[PDB]
Symmetry: C3
Subunit: 338 residues, 3 copies
């Protein structure tokens, strides 16, 4: 019945994003994606704590899918027989059937194909949602990602001027609820099923043990810092499927920010810190003006520094002393100061 060109997309692992056009003169296509569920033990902090994760495509977050308004998105979801649980997928970008969850429940050893029309522009969360208490558990176990539906003319500033990014990164933030024993040590389990009862107890108190970007504390620091150059306009897509976050680029700003994540709304300009509602994605554009290290954090600094929620950007270029300079280096306080 639906007679449009089909285009297969190969997803990549976050924080990177598969190749795509911003502005396009192509008409609507059927864009074909495949997601494979993988349950696996994963390391989530710098002390080697593990937890029984559940993922789309082996990553937390799941990969970013990018399409244009008016495209049809055909998703094959696969639940390999090595998995232990049923899984499904709910797209916040889609209309009907609980975002697709009501049409996509699959047992281990099965797959399903859903098609949804990309009628609403923005960045949107997708996540597993098998039913009842399984919904939060699968989501906080890692089964969430995002999709971006671009306008066919690309981004704009809401005042008739085009915006183009030079680079795009997807930062998925994950709240984790890892059980502890009587002494406070984190517990380990042999399967997700075995972890469930103790994990649900931690979840009920609504306080995460870890808050991480790209699936672990320190994931996007050190050698996995995000690269940019002075003068580049960088789009940072940020998602949180379950809990609020307050992104902040330390030493920078959000030049254009869609904090509710929807491109039919004009962006706010010149933000210090923005707000991603739990259950949503948002996006910020920034043009780097200064080289050096930048930390990208949630600006609950306890979470950022102590629970794992810090990424770095390493930005190459020349320092602009007009914007900022050290006028006098650290020196002894003058004895004749009052």
């Amino acid at each position: 019945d639906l007679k449009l060109p089909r285009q297969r997309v190969d997803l990549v692992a976050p924080p990177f994003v598969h190749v795509h056009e911003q502005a396009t003169k192509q008409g609507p296509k059927i864009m074909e994606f495949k997601l494979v569920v993988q349950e696996k033990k994963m390391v989530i902090d710098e002390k080697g704590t593990t937890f029984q994760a559940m993922t789309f495509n082996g990553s937390m977050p799941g990969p970013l899918m990018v399409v244009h308004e008016g495209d049809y998105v055909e998703v094959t979801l696969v639940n390999p027989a090595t998995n232990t649980m049923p899984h499904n997928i709910d797209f916040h970008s889609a209309t009907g059937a609980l975002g697709g969850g009501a049409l996509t429940l699959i047992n281990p050893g099965e797959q399903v194909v859903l098609r949804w029309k990309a009628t609403r522009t923005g960045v949107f969360v997708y996540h597993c949602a098998p039913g009842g208490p399984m919904i939060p558990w699968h989501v906080v176990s890692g089964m969430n990602g995002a999709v971006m539906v671009l306008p066919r003319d690309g981004l704009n500033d809401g005042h008739g001027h085009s915006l183009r990014y030079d680079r795009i990164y997807y930062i998925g933030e994950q709240d984790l609820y890892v059980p502890r024993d009587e002494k406070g040590n984190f517990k380990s389990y042999d399967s997700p099923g075995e972890a469930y009862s103790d994990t649900e107890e931690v979840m009920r108190k609504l306080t995460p043990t870890h808050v991480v970007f790209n699936g672990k504390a320190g994931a996007l620091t050190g050698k996995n810092a995000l690269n940019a150059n002075v003068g580049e306009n960088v789009l940072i897509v940020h998602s949180q499927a379950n809990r609020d976050s307050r992104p902040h680029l330390i030493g920078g700003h959000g030049d254009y920010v869609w904090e509710t994540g929807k491109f039919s709304n004009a962006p706010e300009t010149g933000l210090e810190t923005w707000f991603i509602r739990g259950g949503s994605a948002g996006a910020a554009l920034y043009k780097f003006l200064q080289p050096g290290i930048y930390a990208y954090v949630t600006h609950n600094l306890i979470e950022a520094a102590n629970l794992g929620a810090t990424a770095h950007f390493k930005v190459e270029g020349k320092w602009n002393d007009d914007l900022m300079t050290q006028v006098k280096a650290p020196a002894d306080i003058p004895t004749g100061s009052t």
Copy 2:
């Protein structure tokens, strides 16, 4: 002194709303409302947990009051002699005297009549506020509701186009703090006064035991699902008097959302999840495009699934396979897949 027509309104129990006009060519009226305080033990979850509630008109939330900009709202507040505590009322829509709380403190066996002018458009919280620590306690015991002050021309999209709703529902969300004994069982009390000290201890740790719509887990599910039809524009008013919420219609969107709740501001369009600041009301308009069950949640899914914060809509009509379709039902993974 004030010589305007008087009109008596009969309130109804949430989630329904008393009859009202959207656009009106009537001039300013004195709109007369009565609220009666009722302290009573209420069931708040599906396991039969009870708590010592304090309510306006016997419901959590209190009823939605609807008037138009420029009306005068005359509220008789009654505190029957069967109650044990003093109560009052503070309208966020009103100007002066702590929103009216400073003029409305009544002991059991008394009543009071306050009049306030509806000078500001939007949806607004009202709540009890007797003074000091009694303020949070009365509010989290259930003494809060909302009022909607419509523009006389009805809603608009902020770009000169009228918006009209076919149906309106009021979803009041309540954070509850129910004490537990040493084993974790919820405690019961014979009066609000007796519950106070233990409840205040739970409140101080800022983590609710329950988060409910319309006064109990499951209130708006099953046979009390909210009804709609494909093609109907539905206004959902959401209030939270004490704690933030992040509403999400699973399988739908917010077509037009006033998340800060004030109709002098243009709505945002096409939201996945919106944000109700604690101490405020907001409103979202959505036109249903697909039949079936929709869950309306706060998108902290722990709260939604495990603490009680899920409502359902049951939507009648014909499925649109253009928007979404199951291309292939669950099937065994092809043996010749890689």
Copy 3:
């Protein structure tokens, strides 16, 4: 190299703000500020609880700095040798070097001079950020304040109309994490260093023991209520360096609110409650219409009433019975009521 007029500003203690012009026809200046770090034990609640605070200029929050777009801000930061820790400063208003933190780390007995260009308008947080876990600890110990960068034409309503305030107050909100002993009593320490390990344990559970304005419960109540008059337009700048807040003026409104705090964005109008993202400052303008006491709160009323987060305004003038009146004082319920 930089050849502009220099102007020394003398800071004052919050909630007051140093003298400044709103609209200015002066060109860019080098505005010179000095901040001195002071570590000291401070009283933070009405029962006399103390904690080991770390402050800019001996106050929580640090003082508000006010400049205009295009000015250069030259800050001398001094860390006296009576202090025990290294400190620095990060300006959310500045571009590069982690907002200045990377250029300003000073040991006790040292000072440093940083210059940053005020290229972005709004109110912005500044805070200490020495590195790693020291970042949240210094911030929640009190080392944070705000800066306001005004447009050279002053504020506007985003629709081409000037806004002018008659009075300005800076309300800094501080989340504190005070350790308790086994019985629940707050612990005291002889130095910040000694308090660290126990404080970090409380911080990890993300629930504050106190939430205060101007450094202590009750700071801005009683005789330190904030003064205004009927008819005055008052700007309230609110900052929170670490945790979300939801400001509300009880009995009033936000006439014009920049909740993300940035004057390049038009304000929202007629708000009941607004939202300050942790890591940001926001600002609300209100014209008082009624005399009397107003409470300014975060509208988590538990925090407001029980954890310390209430300020008062005392507003002089004549009552307007058109806006609000008590039609009938408290009276016995009529025996012939149903």
